[PDB]
From a paper:
The coronavirus S-protein is responsible for both host receptor binding and fusion of the viral and host cell membranes. Its ectodomain is composed of the N-terminal S1 region that harbors the receptor binding domain (RBD) and the C-terminal S2 region that mediates membrane fusion. To address these questions and to gain further insight into how the 229E S-protein mediates membrane fusion, we determined the X-ray crystal structures of three additional RBD (Classes III, IV and V) complexes with hAPN, as well as the cryo-EM structure of the ectodomain of the S-protein trimer. We find that an invariant set of core interactions defines the interaction with hAPN across all the RBD classes characterized.
To gain insight into how loop variation is accommodated while maintaining receptor binding, we have now determined the structures of the Class III-V RBDs in complex with hAPN. RBD Classes III, IV, and V are from viruses that arose while circulating in the human population and they share important features that differentiate them from the tissue culture-adapted Class I virus. In Loop 2, they all have a deletion of two amino acids that allows Arg 357 of Loop 2, the last of the absolutely conserved residues, to form a stronger salt bridge with Asp 315 of hAPN than what was observed in the Class I complex. In Loop 3, all three classes have acquired two leucine residues not found in the Class I sequence: Trp 404 and Ser 407 of Class I are replaced by Leu 402 and Leu 405 in Classes III, IV and V. The sidechains of these leucine residues occupy the volume filled by the tryptophan sidechain in the Class I complex. As a result, Leu 405 makes the apolar contacts with Leu 318 of hAPN, a role played by Trp 404 in the Class I complex. The sequence changes in Loops 2 and 3 lead to a small re-orientation of the main body of the RBD in the Class III, IV and V complexes. This in turn leads to a compensatory twist in Loop 1 which preserves the core Loop 1-hAPN interaction. As a result of the twist, Arg 316 emerges from a different side of Loop 1 where it forms a salt bridge with Asp 288 of hAPN in the Class III, IV and V complexes, which is not possible in the Class I complex. The GGG motif (313-315) at the tip of Loop 1 in Class I is a GVG in Classes III and IV; the presence of the valine residue (Val 314) leads to an increase in the van der Waals contact with hAPN. The Class III, IV and V RBDs all bind hAPN with higher affinity than that of the tissue culture adapted Class I RBD (16-fold for Class V).
Author numbering:
A (entry chain C): 302 to 376, 383 to 416
B (entry chain A): 68 to 967
């Protein structure tokens, strides 16, 4: 698993620096929305995270409704669309010591 | 004799609505001048027949169409007579259009005009502001219309009572934004003539005064947050600043404070937004433009890692002050500038009500006694002051108008507002203000209208006062000065008289009330509040003020009333011993009152100077901030009179002894200067202890501030000096150091990215003891490339504050005043403040000669905004000569004895 998260701020002049980002590109590696939620084949697997980190704006994945942390190899299927009977742990775009915005959700069950 | 030779406008024409289109060119033309092209169409109604149109205009060149500077059209079938000729009257700044026939009464007319102007760096009208992004020279077109500079951007009837609606339009480059009072009326459409330029039309404003208009064109970014009252709030500033988060703090407090004022005064904020923008080049601290408030960068931005707690206080106080103007001044404007205190006096009081709401752990309302009441008592004690409400006929010219933006209108108005709300109670006072706002909304009022609605509140609430509200406040508004309450606690007698710093000064201003006030006295007895008392006569008697044995009284609890208090010798002794026994028994605010009143009383020859100095003895075991500051403030006058004489040495030794215990206490409390006090007041106490400790020769302080600065020089990127200490550590380390420390702090000031930091550096550079450095530094202050014209006067005022530069600046002012006045006439240079500061030290008959000769020489050139400040300097100087002769010896004795 290799989740890539990224987002861009309101472009142009007179931009709102803290408003909700204008572009969002949350991309789960080797995942097809049409095929369905891809499940972890084996307990032996490496999970990386590549969120945008520019200035005070950063992107991270904080596990809220799910009692497991992304990044731990220890101990379930992961998808970007709602999977039934599962929790919704959101992906957020944080502004240091200021408002933050939910840009997308990584579902799991 | 002629209409266009008088400074007041005629009542014949009254405007109704304006159409204005401006276009700044943010690049220099071949002449090297930044210009702005504009077009305006004003619709006005003829209230009285007249054959001439008089409208304000200043530094504006007009395109000739149909052989004249303007084109006159009719509205609703009215026939506009032919225009014979148009002329520009520079003295009164008018655009006179002479007609062949007269105008019809009750008939509307429209006047077209195409004009051009300069986008100068004079911080007035439509002016330019510049900054640096990377290696690029960014340019901004901002505005400052107060007090009478709207005529400098487009022709109009520039008076506060000539309210109207404004259909603003801004033609700017495509890659830049345009802002104004209202929100854009649709997105920006590229100008057809040239696709490289966009066009932004804004919604029509409400009925407002000209001086509240604002047109900004920048590439700024912003941060926004919907307020609790649905108002959109935006904090505009330079991109890098917004990104770094220096606007986040203003965003945190602006919304909440706005909504607080709305609920407190039971009046909504009419506009749908309120933008806060920070210009790199602003003259004043901020301007209350309705919908688009403009600030200095140091008054809006704040860096949690490099700004000081006093900077944070500055921001909230300035924001609160500006947001309060939205109600008092914008929604309800003044009829004429002579009543300026109705706008700035209310804002200066309300600024604390809002700040206390944003940061309630600060108890900022208490600082109003030092920052406002006693700040204006020093000037209001002079016979050359002016009443809170000067007659309308006495204020006419722009110089006389800009002159009223002084401590009197701001602080004394705030002090009178403090005293009013204390004896009326806040809840009652709030009531009357709500009815006063609703009635006169989108209108103009005078001081009388306020008495009417405040009197009504007294009737609905059934509050009992010695007489009508109009007659109690007229005593503080129509006549200048304040009383001094003399108490005879032996017999309980009470006396009052006009307090003057110089008992021999000749009071020229006549007063219908013969300088007698109606003061509400609040007192305490052995630390217990007594029954409030009203004094309606020149002399009275009451048992509330009688004492026996150890009993002592103190009038004016927490200094709510705007008056000084003086007691008999016996009562003073009981107070002094009380301070030495347990000073905590006295209200901390009144502990400052004791020091401040006594010192100003000695200067007035009302009590021996040896008494005032005795009241400063208890400070040796005083930890609070406010009492020490009150002493340091009154003692600053002693520094001004004696820092070039034999008396200074002993004075420094006495202060060095009074403050050293506090300095050691804060060294242990701060873990060797590693941390800062949690309470804001204590943080200020630490600083006042460090500055007073180092200024007076405490070697442990001198070895620390120098070692800190040296550590910084070793790792410039990592600044080890906490922001609160940077101000004082900088000045002292540069004075102790040499050119190597001065150049390093100069390098830092040029490469600085935060204005708060640069301001600290700029002032500290003026602390160099080398006379050649101060002379070089002085020549920098006049180079706009090195020091911003908005900081010129300030930097010069800092150099004259240095005893080694006192004579350098006085010589500088005397030599090139005309050149200094002509070049900066009505621009970024404040002449009153510089005069006030350069003459503060005058104490000899020789200096008085120099000053009187300075007046005689430049009487043809004039003084404008500094006329009153010059007279106040002449009076304060004549008084200083007597004071020094009378106290030079006795004071020296007291300092030498108590220094051991
Ligand atoms: C100056 O005026 C020009 C032209 O009005 C502005 O350029 C355009 O600004 C608009 C509004 O933001 C943008 O329109 C876009 O239309 C596309 C469809 O083609 C739509 O998908 C977008 O959602 C958007 O509404 C457009 O990005 C922009 N065009 C360009 C590339 O210049 C310009 O913003 C104005 N400048 C200022 C500072 O006002
Ligand atoms: C005079 O001012 C002092 C200090 O501002 C006030 O003392 C505070 O009183 C409030 C209650 O109103 C307490 O919560 C604070 O703890 C007190 N501060 C102290 C003593 O440190 C005092 O109330 C004021 N007195 C009046 C009636 O004006
Ligand atoms: C979204 O991110 C992935 C990460 O590699 C990138 O390959 C893809 O081009 C991005 N799509 C967009 C919106 O550019
Ligand atoms: C994703 O699944 C769909 C449905 O079969 C099909 O387009 C293909 O298998 C996958 N598309 C991509 C982009 O690999
Ligand atoms: C503004 O408030 C937010 C949230 O309460 C806080 O995180 C932030 O630190 C504040 N901004 C500053 C720098 O005061
Ligand atoms: C300004 O606009 C308002 C509303 O659109 C309009 O009623 C008024 O006549 C306009 N005034 C001028 C001078 O254009
Ligand atoms: C307006 O005309 C005067 C000369 O009458 C000229 O000195 C000034 O520069 C002109 N204004 C502009 C902006 O060019
Ligand atoms: C000041 O106090 C000293 C003793 O502490 C005393 O000798 C002197 O007379 C006092 N001055 C007055 C007038 O209070
Ligand atoms: Zn103000």
């Amino acid at each position: 698993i290799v989740l890539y998260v990224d987002f861009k701020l309101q472009s142009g002049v007179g931009r709102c620096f803290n408003c909700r980002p204008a572009v969002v590109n949350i991309t789960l590696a080797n995942f097809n929305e049409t095929k369905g939620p891809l499940c972890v084949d084996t307990s032996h697997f490496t999970t990386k995270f590549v969120g945008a980190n520019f200035g005070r704006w950063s992107a991270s994945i904080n596990t809220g409704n799910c009692p497991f942390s992304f990044g731990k190899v220890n101990n379930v299927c992961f998808s970007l669309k709602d999977i039934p009977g599962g929790c919704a742990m959101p992906i957020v775009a944080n502004l240091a010591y200021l408002n933050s915005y939910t840009i997308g959700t990584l579902y799991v069950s | 004799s002629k209409a266009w030779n008088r400074y007041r406008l005629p009542n014949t024409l009254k405007p109704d609505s304006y159409r204005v289109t401006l276009r700044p060119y943010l690049t220099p033309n071949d002449r090297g001048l930044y210009v702005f092209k504009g077009s305006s169409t004003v619709r006005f109604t003829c209230k009285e027949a007249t054959d001439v149109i008089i409208i304000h205009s200043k530094k504006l060149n007009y395109t000739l169409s149909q052989g004249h500077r303007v084109v006159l059209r009719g509205v609703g079938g009215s026939q506009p007579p032919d225009i014979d000729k148009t002329e520009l009257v520079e003295p009164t700044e008018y655009l006179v259009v002479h007609l062949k026939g007269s105008l019809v009464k009750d008939s509307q007319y429209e006047m077209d005009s195409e004009f051009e102007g300069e986008l100068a760096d004079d911080l007035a009208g439509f002016y330019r502001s510049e900054y640096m992004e990377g290696n690029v020279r960014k340019v901004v077109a901002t505005t400052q219309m107060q007090a009478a500079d709207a005529r400098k951007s487009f022709p109009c009837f520039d008076e506060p009572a000539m309210k109207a609606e404004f259909n603003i339009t801004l033609i700017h480059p495509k890659d830049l934004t345009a802002l104004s009072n209202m929100l854009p009326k649709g997105p920006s459409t590229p100008l057809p003539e040239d696709p490289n330029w966009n066009v932004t039309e804004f919604h029509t404003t409400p009925k407002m005064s000209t001086y509240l208009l604002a047109f900004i064109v920048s590439e700024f970014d912003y941060v926004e947050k919907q307020a609790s009252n649905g108002v959109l709030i935006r904090i505009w500033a330079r991109p890098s600043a917004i990104a770094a988060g220096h606007g986040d703090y203003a965003l945190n407090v602006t919304g909440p404070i706005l909504n607080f004022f709305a609920g407190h005064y039971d009046t909504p904020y009419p506009l749908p937004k309120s933008d806060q923008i920070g210009l790199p080049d602003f003259n004043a601290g901020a301007m209350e433009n309705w919908g688009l408030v403009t600030y200095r960068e140091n008054s809006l931005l704040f860096d949690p890692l490099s700004s000081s707690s006093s900077n944070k206080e500055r921001v909230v106080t300035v924001i609160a002050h500006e947001l309060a103007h939205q109600w008092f001044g914008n929604l309800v404007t003044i009829e004429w500038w002579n009543d300026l205190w109705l706008n700035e006096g209310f804002a200066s009081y309300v600024e604390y009500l809002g700040a206390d709401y944003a940061e309630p752990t600060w108890n900022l309302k208490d600082l109003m006694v030092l920052n406002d009441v006693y700040r204006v008592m020093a000037v209001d004690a002079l016979a050359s002051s002016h009443p809170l409400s000067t007659p309308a006929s006495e204020i006419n010219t722009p110089a006389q108008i800009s002159e009223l933006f002084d401590a009197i209108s701001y602080s004394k108005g705030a002090s009178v507002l403090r005293m009013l709300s204390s004896f009326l109670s806040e809840d009652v006072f709030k009531q009357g203000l709500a009815s006063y706002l609703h009635t006169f909304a989108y209108q103009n009022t005078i001081y009388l209208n306020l008495w009417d609605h405040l009197q009504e509140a007294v009737n609905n609430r059934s509050i009992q006062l010695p007489t009508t509200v109009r007659d109690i406040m007229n005593r503080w508004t129509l006549q200048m000065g304040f009383p001094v309450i003399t108490v005879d606690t032996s017999t309980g007698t009470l006396s009052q008289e006009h307090f003057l710093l110089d008992p021999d000064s000749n009071v020229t201003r006549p007063s219908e009330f013969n300088y007698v006030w109606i003061v509400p006295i609040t007192s305490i007895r052995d630390g217990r509040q007594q029954q409030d008392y009203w004094l309606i006569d020149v002399r009275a008697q009451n048992d509330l003020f009688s004492t026996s044995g150890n009993e002592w009284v103190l009038l004016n609890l927490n200094v709510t009333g705007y008056y000084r208090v003086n007691y008999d010798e016996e009562n003073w002794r009981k107070i002094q011993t009380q301070l030495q026994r347990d000073h905590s028994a006295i209200p901390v605010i009144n502990r400052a009152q004791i020091i401040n009143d006594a010192f100003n009383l000695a200067s007035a020859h009302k009590v021996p100077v040896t008494l005032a100095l005795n009241n400063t003895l208890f400070l040796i075991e005083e930890r609070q901030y406010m009492p020490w500051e009150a002493a340091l403030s009154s003692l600053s006058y002693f520094k001004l009179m004696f820092d070039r004489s034999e008396v200074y040495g002993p004075m420094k030794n006495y202060l060095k002894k009074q403050v050293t215990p506090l300095f050691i206490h804060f060294r242990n409390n701060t873990n060797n200067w590693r941390e800062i006090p949690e309470n804001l007041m204590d943080q200020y106490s630490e600083v006042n202890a460090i500055s007073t400790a180092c200024s007076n020769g405490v070697p442990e302080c001198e070895e620390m501030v120098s070692g800190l600065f040296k550590q910084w020089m070793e790792n410039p990127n990592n600044n080890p000096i906490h922001p609160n200490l940077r101000s004082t550590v900088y000045c002292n380390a540069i004075a102790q150091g040499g050119e190597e420390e001065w150049d390093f702090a100069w390098e830092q000031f040029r490469n600085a990215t935060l204005v708060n930091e640069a301001d600290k550096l700029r002032a500290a550079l003026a602390c160099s003891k080398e006379l050649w450095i101060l002379n070089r530094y002085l020549s920098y202050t006049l180079n706009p490339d090195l020091i911003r014209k908005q900081d010129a006067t300030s930097t010069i005022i800092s150099i004259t504050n240095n005893v080694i530069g006192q004579g350098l600046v006085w010589d500088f002012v005397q030599s090139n005043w005309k050149k200094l006045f002509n070049d900066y006439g009505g621009g970024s240079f404040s002449f009153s403040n510089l005069i006030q500061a350069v003459t503060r030290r005058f104490s000899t008959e020789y200096e008085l000669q120099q000053l009187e000769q300075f007046k005689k020489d430049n009487e043809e050139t004039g003084f404008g905004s500094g006329t009153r400040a010059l007279e106040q300097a002449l009076e304060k100087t004549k008084a200083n000569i007597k004071w020094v002769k009378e106290n030079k010896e006795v004071v020296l004795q007291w300092f030498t004895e108590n220094s051991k």
